Amino acid sequence: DVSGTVCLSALPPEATDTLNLIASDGPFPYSQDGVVFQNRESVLPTQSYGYYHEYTVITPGARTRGTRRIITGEATQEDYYTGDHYATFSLIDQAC
């Protein structure tokens, strides 16, 4: 399940950076950015392989990728934030 909806502006500022890189189709800081998210545990709605893709949300001071990510869904304006390494998600609302 998805925890609820969150405004982009209520997320860490790095989330805004990640969405900007997704809109420009990169370049991305990490090689894992853009990989398919399998959603193996069906925390997100179950969809065909390739529906979802994952991108790092940089954590200030973290040596490498930390635990914050954006998952895109294929539908327009469909994006999810996790701060806990895919355990929980909120729908991102870029309008606020």
Side-chain angles (χ1 to χ4, degrees):
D1 302 9
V2 175
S3 289
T5 297
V6 68
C7 291
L8 179 59
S9 63
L11 292 176
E14 295 79 17
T16 296
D17 296 334
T18 300
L19 285 171
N20 285 335
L21 298 178
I22 296 163
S24 68
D25 194 17
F28 297 103
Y30 286 98
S31 63
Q32 301 96 318
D33 294 339
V35 307
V36 174
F37 179 65
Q38 285 194 36
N39 189 42
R40 291 175 207 71
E41 288 80 50
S42 292
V43 177
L44 302 178
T46 300
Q47 302 282 20
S48 47
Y49 169 78
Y51 185 98
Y52 297 111
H53 294 82
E54 58 150 304
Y55 301 83
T56 314
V57 172
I58 290 171
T59 297
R63 291 163 297 168
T64 54
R65 293 187 69 211
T67 67
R68 301 177 185 171
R69 308 279 181 271
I70 288 175
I71 305 296
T72 64
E74 181 177 295
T76 190
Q77 318 303 301
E78 184 184 9
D79 303 273
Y80 303 91
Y81 178 79
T82 177
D84 61 8
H85 220 165
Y86 314 117
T88 63
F89 297 92
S90 307
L91 186 80
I92 307 173
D93 188 347
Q94 295 179 70
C96 60

Short mmCIF file of all heavy atoms in Angstrom, two decimals, residues 7-43:
data_model
loop_
_atom_site.label_atom_id
_atom_site.label_comp_id
_atom_site.label_asym_id
_atom_site.label_seq_id
_atom_site.Cartn_x
_atom_site.Cartn_y
_atom_site.Cartn_z
N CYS A 7 3.12 16.57 -0.91
CA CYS A 7 3.60 17.58 -1.80
C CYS A 7 5.05 17.52 -2.01
O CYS A 7 5.85 17.29 -1.09
CB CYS A 7 3.26 18.95 -1.20
SG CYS A 7 1.48 19.35 -1.17
N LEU A 8 5.50 17.79 -3.25
CA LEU A 8 6.92 17.84 -3.53
C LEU A 8 7.65 18.78 -2.60
O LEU A 8 8.77 18.46 -2.14
CB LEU A 8 7.13 18.24 -5.02
CG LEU A 8 8.59 18.35 -5.44
CD1 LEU A 8 9.35 17.04 -5.24
CD2 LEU A 8 8.67 18.82 -6.86
N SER A 9 7.05 19.93 -2.32
CA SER A 9 7.74 20.92 -1.49
C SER A 9 7.93 20.44 -0.04
O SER A 9 8.69 21.05 0.67
CB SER A 9 6.96 22.24 -1.45
OG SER A 9 5.68 22.05 -0.84
N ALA A 10 7.19 19.42 0.39
CA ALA A 10 7.33 18.86 1.75
C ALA A 10 8.35 17.77 1.83
O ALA A 10 8.62 17.24 2.91
CB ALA A 10 5.93 18.37 2.24
N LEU A 11 8.89 17.35 0.70
CA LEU A 11 9.94 16.38 0.63
C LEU A 11 11.31 17.06 0.71
O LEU A 11 11.41 18.27 0.51
CB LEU A 11 9.87 15.59 -0.68
CG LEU A 11 8.65 14.67 -0.80
CD1 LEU A 11 8.66 14.03 -2.18
CD2 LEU A 11 8.64 13.66 0.34
N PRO A 12 12.39 16.29 0.96
CA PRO A 12 13.69 16.89 0.94
C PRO A 12 13.94 17.59 -0.41
O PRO A 12 13.49 17.11 -1.43
CB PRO A 12 14.64 15.69 1.15
CG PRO A 12 13.81 14.72 1.94
CD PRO A 12 12.45 14.86 1.29
N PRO A 13 14.75 18.66 -0.44
CA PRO A 13 15.00 19.34 -1.70
C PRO A 13 15.65 18.44 -2.75
O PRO A 13 15.45 18.67 -3.95
CB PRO A 13 15.90 20.53 -1.30
CG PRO A 13 16.47 20.17 0.03
CD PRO A 13 15.41 19.30 0.70
N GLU A 14 16.39 17.45 -2.35
CA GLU A 14 17.01 16.53 -3.28
C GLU A 14 15.93 15.79 -4.09
O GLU A 14 16.27 15.33 -5.20
CB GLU A 14 17.94 15.57 -2.54
CG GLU A 14 19.15 16.27 -1.90
CD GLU A 14 18.88 16.97 -0.61
OE1 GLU A 14 17.85 16.74 0.07
OE2 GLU A 14 19.77 17.76 -0.23
N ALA A 15 14.72 15.62 -3.59
CA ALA A 15 13.67 15.01 -4.38
C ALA A 15 13.36 15.85 -5.62
O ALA A 15 13.03 15.26 -6.69
CB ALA A 15 12.48 14.74 -3.52
N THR A 16 13.33 17.15 -5.44
CA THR A 16 13.13 18.09 -6.56
C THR A 16 14.25 17.95 -7.56
O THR A 16 14.00 17.85 -8.78
CB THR A 16 12.96 19.49 -6.06
OG1 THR A 16 11.78 19.61 -5.26
CG2 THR A 16 12.89 20.52 -7.18
N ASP A 17 15.49 17.81 -7.08
CA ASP A 17 16.60 17.59 -7.99
C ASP A 17 16.44 16.31 -8.78
O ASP A 17 16.65 16.27 -10.00
CB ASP A 17 17.88 17.51 -7.21
CG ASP A 17 18.26 18.80 -6.47
OD1 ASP A 17 17.85 19.90 -6.90
OD2 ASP A 17 19.08 18.63 -5.50
N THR A 18 16.07 15.24 -8.11
CA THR A 18 15.89 13.94 -8.79
C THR A 18 14.80 14.06 -9.84
O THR A 18 15.00 13.54 -10.98
CB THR A 18 15.58 12.82 -7.77
OG1 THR A 18 16.68 12.74 -6.86
CG2 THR A 18 15.31 11.50 -8.44
N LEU A 19 13.65 14.63 -9.53
CA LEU A 19 12.60 14.79 -10.53
C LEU A 19 13.13 15.67 -11.72
O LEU A 19 12.73 15.31 -12.84
CB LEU A 19 11.33 15.35 -9.92
CG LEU A 19 10.50 14.38 -9.09
CD1 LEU A 19 9.42 15.16 -8.42
CD2 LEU A 19 9.89 13.27 -9.90
N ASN A 20 13.92 16.68 -11.50
CA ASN A 20 14.47 17.47 -12.58
C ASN A 20 15.35 16.64 -13.45
O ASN A 20 15.28 16.79 -14.71
CB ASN A 20 15.11 18.73 -12.00
CG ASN A 20 14.12 19.77 -11.56
OD1 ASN A 20 12.99 19.80 -12.07
ND2 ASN A 20 14.56 20.67 -10.69
N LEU A 21 16.20 15.77 -12.91
CA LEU A 21 16.99 14.88 -13.71
C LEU A 21 16.15 13.86 -14.47
O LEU A 21 16.43 13.53 -15.64
CB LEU A 21 18.06 14.20 -12.89
CG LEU A 21 19.10 15.12 -12.24
CD1 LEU A 21 20.05 14.28 -11.42
CD2 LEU A 21 19.84 15.96 -13.24
N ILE A 22 15.08 13.37 -13.89
CA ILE A 22 14.20 12.47 -14.60
C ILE A 22 13.59 13.21 -15.78
O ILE A 22 13.49 12.65 -16.91
CB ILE A 22 13.15 11.86 -13.67
CG1 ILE A 22 13.79 10.95 -12.58
CG2 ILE A 22 12.12 11.03 -14.44
CD1 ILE A 22 12.89 10.66 -11.42
N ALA A 23 13.16 14.44 -15.58
CA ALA A 23 12.53 15.23 -16.70
C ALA A 23 13.54 15.47 -17.78
O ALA A 23 13.06 15.50 -18.96
CB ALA A 23 12.01 16.50 -16.13
N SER A 24 14.84 15.62 -17.53
CA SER A 24 15.82 15.87 -18.56
C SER A 24 16.39 14.55 -19.11
O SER A 24 17.29 14.61 -19.92
CB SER A 24 16.95 16.79 -18.04
OG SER A 24 17.75 16.15 -17.07
N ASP A 25 15.91 13.40 -18.66
CA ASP A 25 16.44 12.17 -19.02
C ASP A 25 17.97 12.12 -18.70
O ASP A 25 18.76 11.69 -19.54
CB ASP A 25 16.18 11.94 -20.55
CG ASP A 25 16.40 10.57 -20.96
OD1 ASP A 25 16.43 9.70 -20.05
OD2 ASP A 25 16.63 10.40 -22.22
N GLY A 26 18.34 12.56 -17.49
CA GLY A 26 19.67 12.52 -17.05
C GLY A 26 20.45 13.78 -17.45
O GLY A 26 19.87 14.77 -17.91
N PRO A 27 21.75 13.74 -17.26
CA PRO A 27 22.49 12.66 -16.67
C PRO A 27 22.24 12.50 -15.19
O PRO A 27 21.90 13.44 -14.50
CB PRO A 27 23.94 13.09 -16.93
CG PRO A 27 23.93 14.59 -16.89
CD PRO A 27 22.60 14.95 -17.43
N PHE A 28 22.39 11.27 -14.73
CA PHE A 28 22.16 10.90 -13.35
C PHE A 28 23.49 10.65 -12.62
O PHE A 28 24.47 10.16 -13.20
CB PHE A 28 21.33 9.61 -13.30
CG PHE A 28 19.96 9.78 -13.90
CD1 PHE A 28 19.69 9.29 -15.16
CD2 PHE A 28 18.97 10.43 -13.19
CE1 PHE A 28 18.44 9.50 -15.77
CE2 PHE A 28 17.72 10.62 -13.81
CZ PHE A 28 17.47 10.11 -15.03
N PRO A 29 23.50 10.93 -11.32
CA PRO A 29 24.72 10.71 -10.57
C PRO A 29 25.14 9.29 -10.37
O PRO A 29 26.32 9.02 -10.30
CB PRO A 29 24.44 11.45 -9.23
CG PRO A 29 22.94 11.37 -9.11
CD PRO A 29 22.47 11.64 -10.53
N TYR A 30 24.20 8.36 -10.24
CA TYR A 30 24.46 6.98 -9.96
C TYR A 30 24.14 6.09 -11.12
O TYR A 30 23.11 6.30 -11.80
CB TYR A 30 23.73 6.52 -8.68
CG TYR A 30 24.38 7.06 -7.41
CD1 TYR A 30 23.89 8.18 -6.73
CD2 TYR A 30 25.48 6.43 -6.88
CE1 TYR A 30 24.47 8.64 -5.59
CE2 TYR A 30 26.11 6.90 -5.75
CZ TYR A 30 25.58 7.95 -5.07
OH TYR A 30 26.15 8.41 -3.91
N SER A 31 24.95 5.05 -11.30
CA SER A 31 24.75 4.14 -12.38
C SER A 31 23.44 3.37 -12.25
O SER A 31 22.90 2.93 -13.24
CB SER A 31 25.98 3.17 -12.50
OG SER A 31 26.09 2.39 -11.31
N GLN A 32 22.94 3.19 -11.06
CA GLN A 32 21.67 2.47 -10.78
C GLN A 32 20.42 3.31 -11.08
O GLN A 32 19.30 2.80 -11.09
CB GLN A 32 21.55 2.02 -9.34
CG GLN A 32 22.68 1.10 -8.91
CD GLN A 32 23.84 1.86 -8.18
OE1 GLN A 32 24.33 3.02 -8.54
NE2 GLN A 32 24.34 1.16 -7.15
N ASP A 33 20.64 4.61 -11.29
CA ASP A 33 19.50 5.48 -11.62
C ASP A 33 18.91 5.04 -12.97
O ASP A 33 19.64 4.96 -13.98
CB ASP A 33 19.93 6.93 -11.58
CG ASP A 33 20.32 7.43 -10.21
OD1 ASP A 33 19.91 6.81 -9.24
OD2 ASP A 33 21.03 8.47 -10.16
N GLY A 34 17.60 4.82 -13.02
CA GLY A 34 16.92 4.41 -14.19
C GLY A 34 16.66 2.93 -14.35
O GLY A 34 16.06 2.51 -15.31
N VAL A 35 17.24 2.13 -13.48
CA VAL A 35 16.97 0.71 -13.50
C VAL A 35 15.48 0.41 -13.23
O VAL A 35 14.80 1.21 -12.55
CB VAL A 35 17.87 -0.19 -12.70
CG1 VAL A 35 19.33 -0.01 -13.01
CG2 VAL A 35 17.59 0.03 -11.26
N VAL A 36 14.94 -0.69 -13.76
CA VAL A 36 13.63 -1.15 -13.47
C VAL A 36 13.48 -1.44 -12.00
O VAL A 36 14.32 -2.13 -11.42
CB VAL A 36 13.24 -2.33 -14.33
CG1 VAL A 36 11.91 -2.87 -13.88
CG2 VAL A 36 13.19 -1.95 -15.79
N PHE A 37 12.43 -0.94 -11.38
CA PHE A 37 12.01 -1.35 -10.04
C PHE A 37 11.03 -2.47 -10.19
O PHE A 37 9.97 -2.27 -10.77
CB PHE A 37 11.39 -0.15 -9.32
CG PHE A 37 10.90 -0.49 -7.93
CD1 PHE A 37 11.79 -0.85 -6.94
CD2 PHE A 37 9.60 -0.44 -7.60
CE1 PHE A 37 11.34 -1.17 -5.66
CE2 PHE A 37 9.12 -0.73 -6.31
CZ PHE A 37 10.03 -1.10 -5.33
N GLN A 38 11.37 -3.62 -9.60
CA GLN A 38 10.53 -4.79 -9.81
C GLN A 38 9.28 -4.80 -8.95
O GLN A 38 8.34 -5.53 -9.25
CB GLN A 38 11.29 -6.07 -9.56
CG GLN A 38 12.24 -6.43 -10.63
CD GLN A 38 12.66 -7.94 -10.42
OE1 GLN A 38 11.88 -8.92 -9.98
NE2 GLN A 38 13.84 -8.10 -10.75
N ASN A 39 9.28 -3.98 -7.87
CA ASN A 39 8.12 -4.01 -6.99
C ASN A 39 7.78 -5.44 -6.55
O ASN A 39 6.61 -5.85 -6.49
CB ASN A 39 6.90 -3.38 -7.68
CG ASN A 39 5.71 -3.18 -6.78
OD1 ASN A 39 5.84 -2.75 -5.58
ND2 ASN A 39 4.52 -3.32 -7.33
N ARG A 40 8.85 -6.16 -6.14
CA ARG A 40 8.68 -7.58 -5.93
C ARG A 40 7.67 -7.87 -4.87
O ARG A 40 7.01 -8.92 -4.93
CB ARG A 40 10.02 -8.20 -5.54
CG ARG A 40 11.02 -8.22 -6.67
CD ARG A 40 12.48 -8.73 -6.35
NE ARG A 40 13.56 -8.16 -7.25
CZ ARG A 40 14.00 -6.87 -7.21
NH1 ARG A 40 13.51 -6.00 -6.36
NH2 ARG A 40 14.93 -6.39 -8.00
N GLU A 41 7.62 -7.03 -3.83
CA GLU A 41 6.68 -7.25 -2.72
C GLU A 41 5.31 -6.66 -2.88
O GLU A 41 4.49 -6.75 -1.98
CB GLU A 41 7.22 -6.85 -1.37
CG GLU A 41 8.28 -7.76 -0.85
CD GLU A 41 9.56 -7.38 -1.54
OE1 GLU A 41 9.84 -6.14 -1.53
OE2 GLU A 41 10.21 -8.28 -2.11
N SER A 42 5.02 -6.14 -4.05
CA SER A 42 3.74 -5.46 -4.37
C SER A 42 3.32 -4.43 -3.31
O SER A 42 2.15 -4.26 -3.05
CB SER A 42 2.59 -6.44 -4.70
OG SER A 42 2.77 -7.14 -5.91
N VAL A 43 4.30 -3.67 -2.79
CA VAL A 43 3.95 -2.54 -2.00
C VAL A 43 3.20 -1.50 -2.88
O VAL A 43 2.23 -0.87 -2.44
CB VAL A 43 5.17 -1.92 -1.31
CG1 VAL A 43 4.78 -0.70 -0.56
CG2 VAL A 43 5.86 -2.95 -0.39
#
